[PDB]
Design a binder for this molecule. Structure first.
Ligand SMILES: CC(C)[C@@H](NC(=O)[C@H](CS)NC(=O)CCC[C@H](N)C(=O)O)C(=O)O
Ligand SMILES: [Fe+3]
Length: 329
């Protein structure tokens, strides 16, 4: 038997406004969720998620094999050695069901000094032909900034929750340097569904993606209305119920580092479900040189002996290790 996770719905709208006590009441709810199962649904977030889902489906269902090779990351196309993050992540019929498209900060262009300096984790996005995918790039770039704005407000809530001033995290989250990414993931319906694309957990559960901690400060996730996620608790995995109107929020392992594990990065996994669905995460990453001084809210002096960690090193190592442990997606 599998129980169900408590995932509170938090009205985050005060985080966009100037009612400081209302913001504190949101922060309390974020604190409580972060200390419990680690997840909450952000509601009243102001993003048109119906349009996000519609435009994403139109892209996934119209892109051709030729276009996927043309956009493929280096793991699938040796000609594209600069594409470690951004681009298309191909399915392998018979073996791998999932496929996805990842893009980064649209401000990463050839003019950007991090591109000029060839700093790891910075890449120029690749896009399909506009005439073949009318409106897609424009939608996707505007979405990046829409979800950036939501995430900046959520980071104010997390800062207040931890007893800090509201800009404690958000001051490091900036359009000119953020390493944040959007991933547009398609999980297909397949008949028959090949067993090679299905993993078996230690507890027997059939999975599409194994347990992991998120590589992020926080993760801001939209999913279509098909239940699939489970969060690890001490008493076992618990089902996270779906909600295609809201965003599922949780802390990543950078938050766990800087709070001395006071806000843990929850472990989740993806159950296998034979259903056509979407998983559209926004990974809230800081700048390459961002360093937040660690602290311990449990200690009266807030002191932590954990070393400050540069976000760029954290991200480079984390993305590599996640591929090594859980496979190339
Ligand atoms: C909802 C999640 C479990 C989703 N999985 C994911 O997004 C998994 C686990 S957090 N994330 C990743 O693989 C990291 C992608 C990082 C991205 N290419 C980048 O360069 O920034 C899924 O639906 O599988
Ligand atoms: Fe996760």
């Amino acid at each position: 038997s599998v129980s169900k996770a408590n995932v509170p719905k938090i009205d985050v709208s005060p985080l966009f406004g100037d009612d400081q006590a209302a913001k504190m009441r949101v922060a309390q709810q974020i604190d409580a969720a972060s200390r419990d199962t680690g997840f909450f649904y952000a509601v009243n977030h102001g993003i048109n998620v119906q349009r996000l889902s519609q435009k994403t489906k139109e892209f996934h269902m119209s892109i051709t094999p030729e276009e996927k090779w043309d956009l493929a990351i280096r793991a699938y196309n040796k000609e594209h050695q600069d594409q470690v993050r951004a681009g298309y992540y191909l399915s392998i019929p018979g073996k791998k069901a999932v496929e996805s498209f990842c893009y980064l900060n649209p401000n990463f262009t050839p003019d950007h000094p991090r591109i000029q300096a060839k700093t790891p984790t910075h890449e120029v996005n690749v896009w399909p032909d506009e005439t073949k995918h009318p409106g897609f790039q424009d939608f996707a770039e505007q979405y990046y900034w829409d979800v950036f704005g939501l995430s900046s407000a959520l980071l104010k809530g997390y800062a207040l929750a931890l007893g800090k001033e509201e800009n404690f995290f958000a001051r490091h989250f900036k359009p000119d340097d953020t390493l944040a990414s959007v991933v547009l993931i398609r999980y297909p319906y397949l008949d028959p569904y090949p067993e090679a694309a299905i993993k078996t957990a230690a507890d027997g559960t059939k999975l599409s993606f194994e347990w992991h901690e998120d590589v992020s400060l926080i993760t801001v996730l939209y999913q279509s209305n098909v239940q699939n996620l489970q969060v690890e608790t001490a008493a076992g995995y618990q089902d996270i119920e779906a909600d295609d109107t809201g965003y599922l929020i949780n802390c990543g392992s950078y938050m766990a580092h800087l709070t001395n594990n006071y806000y843990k990065a929850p472990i989740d996994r993806v159950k296998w479900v034979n259903a056509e669905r979407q998983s559209l995460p926004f990974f809230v990453n800081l700048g390459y040189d961002s360093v937040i001084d660690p602290f311990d809210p449990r200690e009266p002096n807030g002191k932590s002996d954990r070393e400050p960690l540069s976000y760029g090193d954290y991200l480079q190592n984390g993305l590599v290790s996640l591929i090594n442990k859980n496979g190339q997606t």
